[PDB]
């Protein structure tokens, strides 16, 4: 669940909760998760954040239903994304998306995830 | 009864849909870097009359000046009466009123099956040395979109020849927007406005626009 | 005397000397000139002058009315306005706040062709509950003229919005109406901008705590074709306290060699304390 | 002592030279101490002990010579101390009401304020001339208030009432209730000052009660009856605004600018010797004190350039800066409390002498009306008026902010804290009024008063910083670290600064993450030679962005506003 | 025969308007021209001076008297403060703009000044109201003894001056947008005195 006063803090704590590379210390504390894997998921949360401000929530919901599909598939293959949807719980934040403000709160939550994934590099 | 006011009305059709830029605010993270200007009540693209007026004034400034002007104040009197002039006292308050342009075929684009009314143009730049790419996302209006253009012209008792003299200038300035661009990032697409159904009618009466609607072919 | 005359304004302009400065309240000068001009606009100037020259006719200045009546601060005994409950509480010694009844804000205006007319107008925008209430002798003539005034505005720069109000004619609270006199002899306060006739100027100037206001300006007229300034008089402000009541006058402040009379209501109305 | 021997020894000791010896003492003996023994006083100077002694001595001589008995003078003074316990010594006073609203085409406003300042001098001088006195029967002057020490004879109170009536009907004849002088007085015994801590304020209470009573009950009877039935003096103020640049000011019978009944005021240079009655020499008071009949005045100076050029300046030598007038209005916080209650803290048996109040008023008039001309030495501004109650200084904005900072720091070195000042610094384009301008920065100084009354509001109704945090945490800490970044690198410019100003101005919880992403994203884009210096700026900016206390965020926003102001081209 | 026959209409902005303000301190990225507003409600207003002057300057283009007796003149002793009282116009549909999703009652239009060669731009942020705002417009006309021969002629000037204000901009940065306005529901009603309003409501609408 995402309140409007904690979701950036949840996203920061979850990016710090991503387990890191204990293997070779050529720049250690890197992630198993790569930027492109996470950024393909922001690539489709941030084109619903654009359309939500223009369209209506009853006109977007095929895309909003497909967000769960793509987050489950991308966290199938390549388990370092399964790590992220467990630590930064997405599939439970996606079932509770019934309002357009809740939709945009989830999209900005995903942006906070990528912001702190880039910050802690 | 020498005071009239006519309405040049037309349809702005787009080709290479235009990016009249909106806020330069901080893009979200992966959202649109540069958006278009939007109507706040329907969230559809508009074309402001400031953008039309300024673009048409700089285009007509290349045809009708006889000398290069450093300011809009230093324009010729055949443009300073139409688009106004702050410094010349006769040419304050005149003469054209460029109303904003709003979508006229939202339902026709709905029947054409398009999802949005703004496409998003994904672009990048390649650094000359090192060949790195830096991406861009630009909202622009979709291609066959159409905007109601109205261009109120005032006719005061003073002119008596300048009315048919200025109609030629307005028609030429609408012909130069079709060859140049509008708003946009025009050297890279983004322009190519067509004007269809050019017709004028006196919305404040007692003037004959028969010869001008003949003059607009 | 008789009922209050609650006036809800929403952006009035009560200029004090200059166009750039509004003063949140209007004296009995302005409401009486307003009633005289609205009687001249109708067919009933002479009836209103016959009522006004009569002794029982009262007008007082305007004071804020957020939920209860306010009163001017009695000068010198221990602000600018007091609640009607808090007058005796103030006079024995207490402290209050000068509550924000309105925002006095200026707006820049111009005349575009002239290129030398760039003026400012100060507006007292009231605060969604405050009204002003002149106290007056109730009459059918007076309510007719006052309900005519509410669609004609009050103050300055009206015809540009400023000053149009609406009426509520309410009865006086019974702890106020005990204290409204004109002939009491001990420790009384003027709640209207008055001026004593010369027999009482001595007794008012000796034992009186007061303030001077300069009532000047132009005389509005439909019969002159140019505008002449009035005779620039000075008068005792509201809240001025005295030894006892005095008898005031309707001052003729007409310009020199002028067709009609330019009057000025300076008859008093008093509050006991 | 050689200065005293040099200017003193050739002396006439007439009543004409009775004036310049006080100016000589306040020039020289003013910073040497009095009796200097380890006892409680240790504070008042020699030039003030001697001044106040001359005050009491003339008051004694008038009380004794108008009581008539003087056989002996010694018979009541040296042999008995019963002289202390009776009411001589009326402390007179007045108040020039309506001074502030009289002041409000901007050098003319300086001339108008200085006109009121010379009226507040000439009232004191002529009131002492009607008496058998001179100056140094005087205390506090300046602003409107002044305080005196007089005799407590009947002669003094009837000439006070007569002079009050005469000068107020003068003010009716020229100013018509916009100005009003109200003399009030309290008769205090000699043992009331000897010590006692409460009866002294009771003396000031009696005085100010009479002043307030005459302030409420302004006029005589027939002075309102007679009263109720291109320009004359504005032509005078125009000519005085021309003559404002001089130093010598002369009291003539009929020259222009009436400042009293049978009085006119003219500003002259040393092309002079035309029928003087006083010479108001300007702030110099030693080198200007070469002519006789010289009363010093402490006001005024430093109009550098005309006001229509202060925004067309700032125009630095590198050629970049925003064309902005600015204006300061700074005032002392808690000053009316200070004059009569500052000495109330150290000891319930408070120090609070007549002499300490005199020296404190002299210190404030010596700071705000003299030394400010040296804190405005080469700073492109013009000080329109300055009294401590208010200091109003238009100018060009970098040196306006520098002037305000130097004035506050020099003030607190002058006073060691315990008394502070608060300021509002507006910022305006050129060709604007000075009524709108003065009113808007008055609103800024009032929003600064509302904060903690030690505060500066640059430019706006927010941005009201404490003054110490503005000095030692905006100029000396944040803006130097911004200037040191953006002038030692080429790749980041104005656009980075504008996008940081926006994130400072919004500040959601999300904008912390968005600013984190932005700064880390611009780490990598730097040349790897400037990536370390950009990383240091990244850490400082993120640290004073995510600081929860909201001090370092609006301070950083103002530092970026000032920095992007001072680097704008045409 | 004294009557006040108050006109009451709805000003629907068909393009968002910018009626000015008072020049105050603007920051770097802040609004370079905010709208005039209510100080207590912080909503966009339309001042009555900005309809009086606009309608008056529009009717001065048509009618050359007829114009001085509706808008006053400090000369001409019979027409001093003549016959019309305007009023500030406040947002009537504040809730209808909350219904169809609108965050703020003002939009901010970004804008620039490409300066002929060098061809360097120069941006600008101006604040507008939005283009379905509707303002509660009133206009009090007055009947007196001098009126009664010229009352009908003073409605073919008020109605004509509203028809002119339709096809002109209203209040501010028009001639490049910014002012298009529609008058909804022209009706007249006596709020003091006795006068038949049915005869001119036929001539209206």
Describe the protein in words.
- It is classed as rna binding protein.
- Keywords: Csm complex, Type III-A, CRISPR-Cas system, RNA binding protein.
- Cryo-EM structure of type III-A Csm-NTR complex.
- Chain A is Type III-A CRISPR-associated protein Csm2.
- Organism of A: Streptococcus thermophilus ND03.
- The structure is cut from a larger assembly and holds 1 copy of chain A (121 residues), 2 copies of chain B, 1 copy of chain C (273 residues) and 1 copy of chain D (570 residues).
- With 121 residues, chain A is mainly α.
- Chain A contains 7 helices and no strands.
- Chain A is elongated.
- Chain B is 23% helix and 27% strand.
- Chain B has 5 helices and 8 strands.
- Chain B starts with a strand and ends with a helix.
- Chain C is of the alpha+beta class and 273 residues long.
- Chain C has helices spanning 28-41, 45-53, 87-91, 140-149, 174-177, 198-207, and strands at residues 4-7, 15-16, 18-22, 70-72, 81-83, 102-110, 118-126, 134-135, 167-168, 180-181, 188-190, 212-215, 233-236, 241-242, 249-250, 265-266, 270-272.
- The longest helix of chain C is centred in the first third of the chain and has 14 residues, at 28-41.
- Chain D is of the alpha+beta class and 570 residues long.
- Chain D has a domain at 307-474: 2-Layer Sandwich (Alpha-Beta Plaits).
- Chain D is 46% helix and 11% strand.
- Chain D contains 20 helices and 15 strands.
- In chain D, strands 11-12-10-13-14-15 form a 6-stranded mixed β-sheet, sandwiched between helices.
- In chain D, helix 6 crosses helix 11 and helix 18 (510-524) runs antiparallel to helix 19.
- Chain D is elongated.
- Chains in contact: A-B, A-D, B-D, B-E, C-D, C-E, D-E.
- Chains C and E meet through strand 6 of C and helix 1 and strand 4 of E.
């Amino acid at each position: 669940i995402l309140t409007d006063e904690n979701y950036v803090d949840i996203a920061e704590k979850a990016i710090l909760k991503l387990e890191r590379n204990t293997r070779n210390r050529k720049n250690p504390d890197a992630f198993f998760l790569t930027t492109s894997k996470l950024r393909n998921l922001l690539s489709l949360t941030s084109t619903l954040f654009d359309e939500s401000k223009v369209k209506e929530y009853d006109a977007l919901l095929d895309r909003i239903a497909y967000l769960r599909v793509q987050f489950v598939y991308q966290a199938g293959r390549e388990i370092a994304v399964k790590d992220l949807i467990e630590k930064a719980q997405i599939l439970e934040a996606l079932k509770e998306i019934k309002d357009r403000e809740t939709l945009q709160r989830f999209c900005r939550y995903m942006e906070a995830l990528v912001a702190y994934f880039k910050f802690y590099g | 009864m020498t005071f009239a006011k006519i309405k040049f009305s037309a349809q702005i059709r787009l080709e290479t849909g235009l990016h009249i830029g909106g806020s330069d605010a901080f893009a979200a993270i992966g959202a649109i870097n540069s958006p278009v200007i939007k109507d706040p009540i329907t969230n559809l693209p508009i074309i402001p009359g400031s953008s039309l007026k300024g673009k048409m004034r700089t285009l007509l400034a290349k045809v009708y000046n006889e000398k290069v002007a450093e300011k809009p104040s230093d324009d010729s009197d055949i443009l300073s009466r139409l688009f106004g002039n702050s410094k010349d006292k006769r040419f304050k308050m005149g003469r054209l009123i460029f109303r904003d342009a709003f979508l006229s075929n939202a339902d026709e684009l709905d029947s054409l099956g398009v999802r949005s009314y703004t496409e998003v143009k994904f672009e990048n730049t390649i650094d000359r040395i090192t060949a790195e790419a830096n991406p861009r996302q630009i909202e622009r209006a979709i291609r066959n979109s159409t905007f109601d253009f109205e261009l109120i012209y005032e006719i005061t008792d003073e002119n008596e020849n300048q009315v048919e003299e200025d109609f030629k200038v307005i028609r030429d300035g609408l012909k130069l927007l079709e060859l140049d661009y509008l708003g946009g990032s025009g050297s890279r697409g983004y322009g190519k406005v067509a004007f269809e159904n050019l017709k004028a009618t006196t919305v404040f009466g007692n003037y004959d626009v028969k010869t001008l609607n003949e003059l607009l072919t | 005397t008789y009922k209050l005359y609650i006036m809800t304004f929403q952006n009035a302009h009560f200029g004090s000397g200059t166009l750039d400065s509004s003063k949140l309240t209007f004296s009995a000068d302005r409401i009486f000139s307003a009633l005289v001009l609205e009687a001249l606009k109708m067919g009933k100037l002479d009836a209103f002058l016959a009522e006004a020259n009569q002794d029982k006719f009262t007008l007082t200045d305007a004071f804020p009315f957020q939920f209860g009546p306010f009163l001017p601060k009695p000068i010198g005994y221990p602000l600018q306005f007091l609640a009607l409950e808090n007058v005796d509480d103030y006079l024995n010694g207490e402290l209050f706040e000068n509550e924000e009844h309105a925002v006095i804000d200026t707006v820049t205006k111009n005349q575009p062709h002239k290129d030398d007319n760039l003026y400012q107008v100060a507006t007292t925008r009231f605060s969604n509950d405050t009204s002003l209430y002149v106290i007056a002798n109730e009459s059918d003539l007076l309510n007719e003229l006052m309900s005519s005034l509410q669609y004609s505005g009050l103050g300055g720069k009206r015809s540009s919005g400023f000053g149009r109000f609406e009426l509520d004619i309410q009865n006086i609270p019974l702890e106020l109406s005990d204290r409204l006199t004109k002939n009491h002899s001990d420790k009384v306060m003027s709640l209207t901008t008055a001026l004593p006739v010369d027999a009482d100027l001595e007794e008012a100037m000796e034992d009186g705590h007061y303030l001077l206001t300069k009532s000047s300006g132009f005389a509005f007229s439909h019969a002159t074709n140019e505008n002449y300034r009035k005779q620039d008089l000075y008068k005792f402000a509201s809240g001025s306290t005295f030894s006892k009541t005095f008898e005031g006058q309707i001052v003729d402040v007409r310009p020199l060699d002028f067709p009609h009379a330019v009057l000025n209501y300076a008859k008093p109305l008093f509050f006991k304390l | 002592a050689t200065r005293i021997k040099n200017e003193l020894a050739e002396f006439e000791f007439n009543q004409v030279q009775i004036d310049s010896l006080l100016n000589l003492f306040e020039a020289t003996l003013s910073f040497v101490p009095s009796s200097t023994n380890t006892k409680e006083i240790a504070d008042i100077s020699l030039a003030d002990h001697s001044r106040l002694t001359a005050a009491f001595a003339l008051a004694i001589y008038d009380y004794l010579e108008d009581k008539g008995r003087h056989n002996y003078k010694e018979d009541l003074f040296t042999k008995v101390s019963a002289f202390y316990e009776e009411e001589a010594f009326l402390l007179a006073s007045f108040d020039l009401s309506g001074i502030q609203d009289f002041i409000y085409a901007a050098k003319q406003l300086k001339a108008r304020s200085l006109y009121l300042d010379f009226m507040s001098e000439y009232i004191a001088d002529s009131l002492l001339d009607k008496l058998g006195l001179n100056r140094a029967n005087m205390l506090y002057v300046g602003g409107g208030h002044a305080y005196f020490v007089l005799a407590n004879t009947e002669k003094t109170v009837e000439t006070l009432v007569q002079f009050e009536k005469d000068f107020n009907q003068f003010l009716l004849a020229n100013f018509q209730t916009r100005l009003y002088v109200a003399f009030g007085w309290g008769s205090f015994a000699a043992k009331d000052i000897m010590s006692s801590p409460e009866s002294y304020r009771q003396v000031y209470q009696k005085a100010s009660r009479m002043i307030s009573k005459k302030k409420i009950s302004r006029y005589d009877y027939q002075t309102l009856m007679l009263l109720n039935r291109v320009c004359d003096i504005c032509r005078g103020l125009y000519q005085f605004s021309k003559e404002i640049a001089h130093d010598h000011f002369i009291i003539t019978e009929n020259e222009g600018l009436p400042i009293g009944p049978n009085a006119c005021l003219k500003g002259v240079a040393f092309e002079k010797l035309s029928q003087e009655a006083f010479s108001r020499v300007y702030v110099k008071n030693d080198y200007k004190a070469g002519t006789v009949k010289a009363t010093h005045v402490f006001v005024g100076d430093y109009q550098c350039d005309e006001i229509y050029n202060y925004a067309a300046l700032s125009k630095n030598e590198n050629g970049l800066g925003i064309k902005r007038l600015a204006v300061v209005r700074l005032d002392v916080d808690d000053l009316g409390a200070a004059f009569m209650a500052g000495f109330s803290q150290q000891g319930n048996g408070q120090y609070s002498t007549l002499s300490r109040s005199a020296t404190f008023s002299r210190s404030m008039s010596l700071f705000f009306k003299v030394y400010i001309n040296q804190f405005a030495s080469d700073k492109k501004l013009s000080i329109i008026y300055a009294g401590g109650d208010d200091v109003f200084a238009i100018g060009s904005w970098q040196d306006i902010i520098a002037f305000t900072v130097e004035l506050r720091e020099n003030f607190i070195k002058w006073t060691n804290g315990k008394l502070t000042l608060s300021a509002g610094i507006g910022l305006f384009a050129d060709k604007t009024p000075i009524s709108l301008m003065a009113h808007q920065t008055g609103e800024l100084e009032e929003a600064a008063k509302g904060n903690e009354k030690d505060s500066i509001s640059l430019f706006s109704s927010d941005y009201t910083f404490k003054f110490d945090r503005f000095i030692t945490n905006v100029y000396d800490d944040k803006l130097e670290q911004i200037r040191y970044f953006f002038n030692h690198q080429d790749e980041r410019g104005k656009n980075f600064i504008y996008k940081l100003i926006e994130l400072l101005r919004n500040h959601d919880r999300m904008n912390m993450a968005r600013l984190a992403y932005y700064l880390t994203r611009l780490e990598e884009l730097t040349r790897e030679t400037d990536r370390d210096k950009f990383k240091t700026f990244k850490n400082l900016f993120y640290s004073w962005y995510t600081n929860k206390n909201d001090k370092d965020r609006k301070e950083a926003e103002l530092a970026l506003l000032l920095y992007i102001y001072e680097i704008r081209k045409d």
